[PDB]
């Protein structure tokens, strides 16, 4: 046949399943992708004026402690030694971040030793017991105290969720967000970096196999009857929206979206660091990205007098907005449970498997999407394709 | 013969020359070492109470942009992904360091953009032109201004050199010590890390070759007549003190030394970072090292409730002191020039080559010692050993 497997969507989940079927099982795979490019939201491209690598669907930082995933992705791209670090802008000062001895010195005005800082946090957070917290605000204060909460958490959280933190669940915070040393590595994972030749090249490499066919600008729902008629026995791995697949018969799942305002500035360096959080309510955006600083190894191909920045805004996703993060209200959780039963039936009757962020209503980092695809391949697809 | 080459001293210079003769030329090499261990000042050992890897002759950080040197040392040890970072303690606050947007925000009280910081430094340093500076103090001020100089440079410099900075040469500062971004990587080199199993294991591996014999607790000057009588044609590579070799016939070269005060404390974490500079005159030491933080990958073999720290003191080297850094007064420079003529004659008549820190009166980082040994091997020893 012309294909043995159809994959809908070319994000990291779809690419991983397609590449494994192609290279491990020697199967012909057809990838159907609605957008004009591969890679889903991880995709990046050159900004035209400067040549700088930018993102249109969020900045993407790769990090994992899963060695299988790390070994896997390194088959398709090398990674730089980039280590993500973030600074937090509050009341006109850039604070070291996350909360640690650095921020603590800057905020409380003098140096605290690790043991002194532990004692300070105990004093500050004495007010509320975490076991008695009824919402996010109280849970936060029960852990780090009011001054820290009000300076670095309250307004940022309010902007991101478009909600008062008093109206968020205490379950959103599950551990002490304070380090008692000077370590300001943002991520805690064993492996970390950025694709040496960019995300577009990495993701294109994953799809570059003699057994893989890619059709861009193609909506599954417009071509599916034709494609399956060519080979009715071919399973489908679907990574598009779960509720849309079933014609919203159980309602519309709720998502948050993001707006990105991207500007080219006539300076070589706007903020001297890749990411600056804006923690104060007077700034409508949550953070600014300056893309050149993600790849300092490319400095002699970047312009000396221009830079690309991007301001990020958060809000509820309306019709026509890119859905990025599941909201997960109890209402959402229950129509999700209904959709899972519909999906499970569809797998049984139609050999259509459901995966990825959109297909399962679940936010997945890149390495988690990859791990999830590897699992579906190992535990479902090998048998379904024999 | 029992040996074809004698090497005096087992620091990185001696080890490199010995290992290259041994493995590349297949020559028998005898290494003579006065101390009870290999490795010279780079040598490290476990502190007995805690097991933590410590140094007795200064903390050693490996970094280089020389790819040949990097490829070479990786034959003998793997390196961690450690990146050196330093903080500066001034008036009760730990400042981000070296001088950059971080320190500038903390010191001048609010956030400056890269371009604003460049303008601030121009204003601050307007006082003196660098072309008009007559000493270190003026040269420093001509570059970064009085407030920064007086807070972070003056007293630290005074403690290290035991001299008023007004009495030091303007030539000690040769570039702008300010970064206009948030990058606080201490070193600027392409490659960097720490030996995975410690320095003692690395340096022992370099000497571990069927063609290498090592005699510890052996002073060259006490055994040389006997050794050379066994094989008079064997060249000698000497890395001991240059002036001592010639019986101080032209005077004593002047050196700075260091005292280290090493303590085990009953806390798991003293300062939350490997190195804290103490920039104020009220502290007699220049900096404190906390050795566990050089190897965070070993945390589950380090004690949870103890830590080893070390305070570092600088002064002139007197009889019995370890000579660490050449002072290089004009008096020193001229007896050095006299000794170079004596050494050059000794190479011609006695086949004794002079190299390394002590043998050439020159401070050498590890990678520079290695590069220098590789050069002597390539350009002198291959011919001398044929
Ligand atoms: C704002 C944002 C920031 C992120 N930052 C990071 C980060 O820093 N680090 C990290 O590890 N992860 C990050 N992620 C997650 C990252 O994008 C993952 O790779 C992604 O979640 C993987 O899930 P996926 O492959 O299912 O999804 P997607 O990337 O969404 O891919 C799904 C694909 O299916 C296509 N599709 C949908 N419907 C149809 C249809 N009907 N027919 C055909 N094709 C269709 C879509 O066009 C898309 O290309 C971020 C995600 C977002 C949204
Ligand atoms: C305080 C300090 C800190 C340092 N920190 C760093 C750092 O962070 N990074 C870095 O890259 N480098 C650092 N270095 C430099 C590092 O130690 C180099 O490896 C060294 O300078 C290399 O020169 P070498 O091999 O000639 O010297 P040495 O290490 O001094 O070795 C010379 C050897 O010769 C032996 N010897 C002397 N006289 C005799 C004799 N008569 N007979 C027999 N043996 C003899 C000595 O015992 C010694 O073992 C530091 C050095 C010091 C002193
Ligand atoms: O300055 C801050 C930062 C975070 N938060 C709290 O932490 C939550 C989550 O923080 P972020 O969304 O800003 O960041 P994450 O660590 O959760 O995840 C980040 O890293 C991910 C990669 O793994 C993606 O890139 C993602 O978009 C990016 O936000 C916020 O809602 C808020 O409650 C604050 O209060 N203040
Ligand atoms: O807080 C500081 C630090 C440095 N200096 C100035 O800079 C000079 C040199 O600084 P350091 O000796 O402290 O450090 P280096 O960068 O020169 O070298 C460091 O790294 C080396 C490895 O390459 C060795 O480990 C060495 O011992 C260690 O000091 C000082 O004399 C002083 O004039 C200051 O004024 N203030
Ligand atoms: Na509490
Ligand atoms: Na000046």
Cα of B4 to ligand 5 centre, how many Å?
A: 72
Q: Whose CA is nearest to atom 20 of ligand 3?
A: A61
* Rounded distance between C-alpha atoms, residue B345 and residue B134, angstroms: 39
Which of A372, A297, A274, A290 is CA-nearest to residue A79? Answer: A297
Nearest to B272 among A94, A109, A180 (CB): A180
* Closest ligand by atom to A287 CA: 3
- CB contacts < 8 A, A to B, total 80
Q: List chain A domain ranges.
A: 1-83+187-254+329-386, 84-186+255-328
DSSP state of B15: H
Nearest residue of B to residue A95, measured between CA atoms: B102
Kindly give the residue spans of alpha helices, DSSP state H, lying in B307-355.
Answer: 330-350
Q: Quick one: which atom of ligand 3 is closest to the CA of A88? A: 1
Q: What is the residue-wise DSSP string for B172-237? A: G--S----SSS---S---SEEE-BTT-HHHHHHHHH-STTEEEE-S--HHHHHHHHHHH-TT--EE
Q: Say whether B270 and A96 touch across the interface (CB within 8 A).
A: no
- Tokens read off for B137: 């103090």
**Side-chain half-sphere of B268: how many Cα atoms within 13 Å?**
13
Strand positions, DSSP E, B224-369: 236-238, 255-265, 275-278, 287-290, 307-316, 325-326, 352-354
Among B69, B138, B152, B160, which is best to mutate for testing ligand 4, by the most ligand atoms less than 8 A from CB? B160
Sign of CA dihedral B188, B194, B199, B203: negative
Sign of CA dihedral B126, B129, B133, B136: positive
Write the CA distances from B350 to A152, A226, B42, B343, B353, integer angstroms: 71, 90, 30, 10, 9
- Technique used by the depositors: X-ray
* Rounded distance between C-alpha atoms, residue B30 and residue B213, angstroms: 5
* Rounded distance between C-alpha atoms, residue A15 and residue B180, angstroms: 41
Q: Provide CB contacts within 8 A for B230, sequence distance 6+.
A: B1, B2, B3
Sign of CA dihedral A66, A71, A77, A81: positive
Distance from CA of A326 to the nearest CA of B (A): 34
Does ligand 4 come within 6 angstroms of the Cβ of B314?
no
Superfamily of domain A1-83+187-254+329-386: NAD(P)-binding Rossmann-like Domain (3.40.50.720)
Surface-to-core class of residue A383, CB atoms within 10 Å of its CB (0-12 exposed, 13-18 middle, 19+ buried)? exposed
* Rounded distance between C-alpha atoms, residue B256 and residue B315, angstroms: 6
Q: Is A337 near chain B, with CB under 8 Å?
A: no
Residues of A noted as catalytic: 175, 179, 256, 287, 312, 363, 365
Nearest residue of B to residue A86, measured between CA atoms: B182
Distance from CA of B260 to the nearest CA of A (A): 22
In the set B110, B175, B225, B319, the catalytic residue is B175
Sign of CA dihedral B240, B244, B247, B251: positive
* Rounded distance between C-alpha atoms, residue A274 and residue A301, angstroms: 17
Cis peptide before A337 (omega within 30 of 0): no
Q: Is A272 near chain B, with CB under 8 Å?
A: yes
* Rounded distance between C-alpha atoms, residue B133 and residue B141, angstroms: 9
* Best of B93, B111, B277, B289 to mutate (most A CBs within 10 Å, chain A): B111
A94 contacts on B by Cβ (under 8 Å): 101-102, 105, 111, 182
List the end-to-end C-alpha distance of chain B, in Å, as a whole number.
14
Q: Is B92 near chain A, with CB under 8 Å?
A: yes
Phi, psi of A382 (to 5 degrees): -60, -45
How many CB atoms neighbour CB A158 within 10 A? 18
Nearest to B182 among A81, A181, A272 (CB): A272
Which of A95, A111, A97 is CA-nearest to residue A183? Answer: A97
Q: Quick one: which atom of ligand 4 is closest to the CA of B63? A: 23
* Rounded distance between C-alpha atoms, residue A354 and residue A348, angstroms: 12
Residue found by looking up tokens 């946090």 in the block: A121
A12, A42 contact by CB (below 8 A): yes
Nearest residue of A to residue B81, measured between CA atoms: A81
- Tokens read off for B202: 């690395």
Q: Whose CA is nearest to atom 35 of ligand 1?
A: A9
Strand positions, DSSP E, B65-206: 86-90, 93-97, 191-193
Residue found by looking up tokens 């370099």 in the block: B206
Nearest to A110 among B92, B113, B182 (CB): B92
């Amino acid at each position: 046949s012309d294909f043995d497997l159809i994959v809908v969507g070319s994000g990291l989940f779809g690419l991983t399943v397609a590449e494994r079927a192609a290279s491990q099982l020697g199967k012909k795979v057809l990838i159907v992708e609605k957008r004009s490019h591969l890679g889903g939201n991880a995709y990046s491209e050159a900004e035209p004026e400067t040549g700088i690598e930018i993102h249109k669907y969020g900045a993407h930082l790769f990090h994992t402690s899963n060695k299988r995933v790390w070994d896997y992705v390194n088959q398709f791209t090398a990674f730089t030694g980039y280590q993500h670090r973030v600074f937090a802008m509050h009341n006109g000062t850039a604070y070291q971040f996350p909360m640690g001895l650095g921020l603590i010195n800057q905020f409380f005005g003098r140096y605290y030793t690790p043991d002194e800082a532990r004692e300070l946090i105990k004093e500050q957070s004495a007010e509320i017991d975490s076991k008695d917290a009824t919402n996010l605000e109280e849970k936060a204060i029960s852990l780090i105290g009011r001054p820290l909460y009000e300076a670095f958490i309250r307004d940022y959280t309010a902007k991101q969720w478009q909600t008062d933190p008093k109206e968020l669940p205490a379950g959103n915070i599950t551990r002490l967000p304070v380090r008692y040393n000077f370590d300001n590595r943002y991520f805690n994972d064993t492996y970390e970096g950025l694709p040496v030749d960019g995300y577009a090249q990495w993701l294109s490499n994953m799809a570059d196999h003699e057994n893989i066919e890619v059709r861009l600008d193609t909506d599954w729902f417009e071509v599916r009857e034709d494609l399956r008629a060519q080979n009715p026995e071919a399973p489908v791995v679907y990574t598009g929206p779960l509720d849309r697949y079933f014609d919203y018969s159980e309602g519309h799942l709720g998502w948050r979206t993001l707006d990105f305002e991207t500007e080219v500035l006539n300076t070589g360096d706007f903020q001297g660091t890749p990411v600056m959080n804006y923690n104060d309510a007077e700034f409508p955006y949550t953070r600014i990205h300056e893309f050149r600083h993600f790849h300092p190894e490319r400095e002699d191909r970047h312009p000396k007098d221009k830079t690309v920045i991007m301001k990020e805004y958060s809000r509820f996703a309306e019709e026509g907005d890119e859905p990025y993060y599941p909201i997960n209200t109890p209402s959402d959780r229950e129509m999700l449970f209904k959709y899972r039963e519909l999906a499970d039936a569809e797998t049984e009757s139609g050999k259509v498997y459901f995966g990825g962020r959109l297909g399962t209503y679940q936010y997945l980092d890149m390495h988690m999407a990859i791990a999830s695809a590897l699992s579906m391949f190992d535990n479902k697809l090998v048998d379904a394709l024999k």
